[PDB]
Design a protein around this ligand. Structure first.
Ligand SMILES: [Cl-]
Ligand code: NA
Length: 328
């Protein structure tokens, strides 16, 4: 060969009380089990930690394995989770046409992600997969990439009904995002704790709900019909939201809790202001290049977003086409 390489491939349920240490050029493949419970530290180098229903080493053309379609991961009482490599969690049983009985609960005191953290969850067309997924370290520091994808039992993106609720943060936690979040497929990302830093969040067909009172430094990009929704009272900061428009890739939207009273858009500043009947005004930076006459506003029950909250919804009837702002 020439270089070092370690592969640990470990089948079945695991109750892990020792530290999880993955070296550089090393892969630790926990697979097959229905119950995973970790309670000590994680030190992931420039290698891969994989926890999933199918082995990391299985492929598109692999025969099914006789494991239950059930996947429960708990990380709790862990003091430190440090990821410098790839950390993948996947609940999908290949070629199963039932939803996994699945829960993911990630509650380490500290989670520092310097590499890639990816969660892959199954959706099934015609079914309604709604697994439990809570990512709420007391302290979450993302210097790398946090991907959440909902895929079919063969690995294509799932875009159907049953938006999977993914709780990110909690009322006491602190999240700093300094690089990238990307949520792909039928995901309702519930941002339930404070987020600060300087980062991008890509919503590829997904919905993100800003439910907390601190959401700063985060630029949001709406792709393939993704939507930004805010349920908390207006933020002091003007959130940047790119991609509002209508194309054949979908209709993206921006929505604020309540019922619409009015809106104003300044084509020389890029700021749109949405005012609700209760008198709350939400300000967002959507870019210059929009024609005020082509905005559309509606009230929604929430059902279009698989929410129970009423929303005042802003859309735009032509494609996203940003321009540089000019006062003129
Ligand atoms: Cl749910
Ligand atoms: Na409602």
């Amino acid at each position: 060969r020439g270089s070092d390489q370690t592969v640990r491939s470990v089948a079945g349920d695991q109750r892990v009380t020792d530290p999880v240490i993955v070296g550089d050029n090393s892969i630790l493949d926990y697979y097959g089990g229905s119950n995973y419970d970790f309670s000590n530290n994680f030190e992931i180098g420039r290698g891969t930690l994989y926890i999933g229903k199918e082995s990391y080493f299985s492929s598109f053309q692999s025969a099914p394995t006789d494991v239950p379609n059930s996947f429960h991961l708990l990380i709790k009482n862990t003091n430190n989770l440090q990821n410098n490599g790839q950390f993948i969690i996947e609940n999908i049983k290949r070629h199963a046409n039932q939803c996994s009985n699945s829960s993911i609960q990630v509650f380490p005191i500290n989670f520092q992600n310097d590499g890639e953290f990816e969660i892959i969850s199954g959706g099934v067309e015609g079914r309604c997969c709604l697994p439990t997924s809570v990512i709420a370290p007391q302290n979450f520091l993302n210097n790398g990439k946090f991907y959440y994808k909902v895929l079919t039992d063969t690995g294509s993106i799932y875009s159907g009904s049953c938006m999977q609720n993914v709780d990110i943060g909690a009322s006491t936690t602190t999240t700093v995002n300094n690089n990238l979040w990307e949520f792909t497929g039928s995901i309702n990302a519930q941002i339930n704790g404070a987020v600060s830093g300087a980062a991008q969040i890509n919503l590829d067909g997904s919905n993100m709900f800003v439910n907390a009172n601190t959401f700063s430094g985060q630029v949001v990009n709406l792709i393939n019909g993704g939507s930004f929704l805010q349920t908390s009272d207006p933020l002091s900061n003007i959130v940047v939201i790119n991609g509002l428009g209508t194309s054949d890739t979908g209709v993206t939207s921006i929505a604020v809790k309540g019922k619409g009273k009015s809106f104003t858009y300044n084509p020389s500043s890029g700021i749109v202001k949405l005012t609700t009947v209760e008198g709350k005004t939400y300000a967002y930076q959507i870019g210059c290049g929009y024609n005020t006459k082509k905005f559309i506003t509606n009230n929604d029950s929430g059902a279009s977003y698989e929410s129970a909250d009423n929303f005042f919804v802003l859309t735009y009837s032509e494609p996203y086409s940003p321009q540089t702002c000019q006062l003129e």
